[PDB]
């Protein structure tokens, strides 16, 4: 099968900027100026949308800022200027050999200004401590980039590894992110320790923050 490799995995640019994403094939997908590479665009919770076909043919309704180039095994899609509607995921696809294969995708993200995340922690409610389980949540409000790191520390140094992370999509106004890790442990396991802290690590943070309760 023909394998498509897209890069960069992620790409953070600002509105108005020019983007250039490339798709590489493990083998030639051409023939006498005849190409077999197409590009698609996919927004969150939405069906792909055909952008370009035959390596350089615009589809109806696709603006003029888009353009696709490439030959043999190296192809690239370019967006002269990034408009609000352009931020999404792009997929290059081959149709030269069966099976037809797609690319891993390239996420164009809205690059902004670093923002230190607002950290918060929450002790297990009472009703929950009744059902026999305990879930400690540590919030991480509006921060950028998306790269961060929460560290759960029960009774100090005793940092566990039984949590579940959940990051929010980029905001539709301040392009920020929110992350919430949750540490779940049986009531008994809960009523056995006293200090529960959530250590955060972010570029926007001068030094790793921590939020604990007793």
């Amino acid at each position: 099968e023909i394998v498509l490799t897209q890069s960069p995995g992620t790409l953070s640019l600002s509105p108005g900027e020019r983007a250039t994403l490339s798709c590489k094939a493990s083998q030639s997908v051409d023939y006498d100026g005849d190409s077999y590479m197409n590009w698609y665009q996919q927004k969150p919770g939405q069906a792909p949308r055909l952008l370009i076909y035959a390596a350089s043919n615009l589809e109806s309704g696709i603006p003029d800022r888009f353009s696709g180039s490439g030959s043999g095994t190296d192809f690239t899609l370019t967006i002269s200027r990034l408009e609000p509607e352009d931020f999404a995921v792009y997929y290059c696809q081959q149709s030269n050999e069966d099976p037809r294969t797609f690319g891993q995708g390239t996420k164009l993200e809205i690059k902004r200004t670093v923002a230190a995340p607002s950290v918060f922690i929450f002790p297990p409610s009472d009703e929950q401590l009744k059902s026999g389980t305990a879930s400690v949540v540590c919030l991480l409000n509006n921060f950028y980039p998306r790269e961060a790191k929460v560290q759960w520390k029960v009774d100090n140094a005793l940092q566990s590894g039984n949590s579940q992370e959940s990051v929010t999509e980029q905001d539709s106004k301040d392009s920020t992110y929110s992350l919430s890790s949750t540490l779940t442990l049986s009531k008994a396991d809960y009523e056995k320790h006293k200090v529960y802290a959530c250590e955060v690590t972010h570029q926007g943070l001068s030094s790793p923050v921590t939020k604990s309760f007793n």
Binding site: D34, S118, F122, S135, Q164, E165, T168, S178, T182
Partner: protein
């Protein structure tokens, strides 16, 4: 205009099977081939196979052969893909897209909205909400954070309002996460200035359609 309509999302127990429908309109159904693509949650697009509705010829991705089966109904202009011997892996959104040719190159121009298939042995159970009390005397600053915890539920999705659709700022509903219990879990937060914490009554409204569970908690 031209468009493709897919059947609704479905939940099925492992070892079972599902038939997804994709009825076309706006064009001569027999004039084009149908493409079936799969998109696992979080993963990318994966081509499954193709079918020529005129004479019914198929061609599958060598890895989906014997799992998916393509058929068409010219009389009702509808394509059908059947997955059998379902497993957790089979959980993904399934897309059917119209095929198109340009100098031997085949590209898919019209896509259906996709059909979600969830393979779980969980049971259509309702959600529980455990308040995420704001603070424990932390004030100092200006802003405070609260939240509601929707623990264990199935299947997706769940609605989470705040102060009855009239509270939209600061809201941060996080994507649900699947626990090993086979059940789901989601959280919803609403950033609010501490100075209002005592003068405002916040209530997160949860609405799970599958189990008809409407819960109003006051954080």
């Amino acid at each position: 205009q031209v468009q493709l309509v897919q059947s609704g999302a479905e939940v099925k127990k492992p070892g079972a099977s599902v038939k997804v429908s994709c009825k076309a309109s706006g064009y001569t159904f027999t004039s084009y081939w149908m493409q079936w693509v799969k998109q696992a949650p979080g993963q990318g697009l994966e081509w499954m196979g193709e079918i020529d509705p005129s004479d019914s010829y198929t061609n599958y991705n060598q890895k989906f052969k014997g799992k998916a089966t393509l058929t068409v109904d010219t009389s009702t202009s509808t394509a059908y893909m059947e997955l059998s011997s379902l497993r957790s892996e089979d959980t993904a959104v399934y897309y059917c897209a119209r095929n198109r040719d340009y100098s031997n190159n085949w590209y898919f121009d019209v896509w259906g909205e996709g059909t979600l298939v969830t393979v779980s042995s969980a049971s259509t159970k309702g959600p529980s909400v455990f308040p995420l009390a704001p603070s424990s005397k932390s004030t100092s600053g200006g802003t405070a954070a609260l939240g509601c915890l929707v623990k264990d539920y199935f299947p997706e999705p769940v609605t989470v309002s705040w102060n009855s659709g009239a509270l939209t700022s600061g809201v941060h509903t996080f994507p649900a996460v699947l626990q090993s219990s086979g059940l789901y879990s989601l959280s919803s937060v609403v950033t609010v200035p501490s100075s209002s914490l005592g003068t405002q009554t916040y209530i997160c409204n949860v609405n799970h359609k599958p189990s008809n569970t409407k819960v109003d908690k006051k954080v």
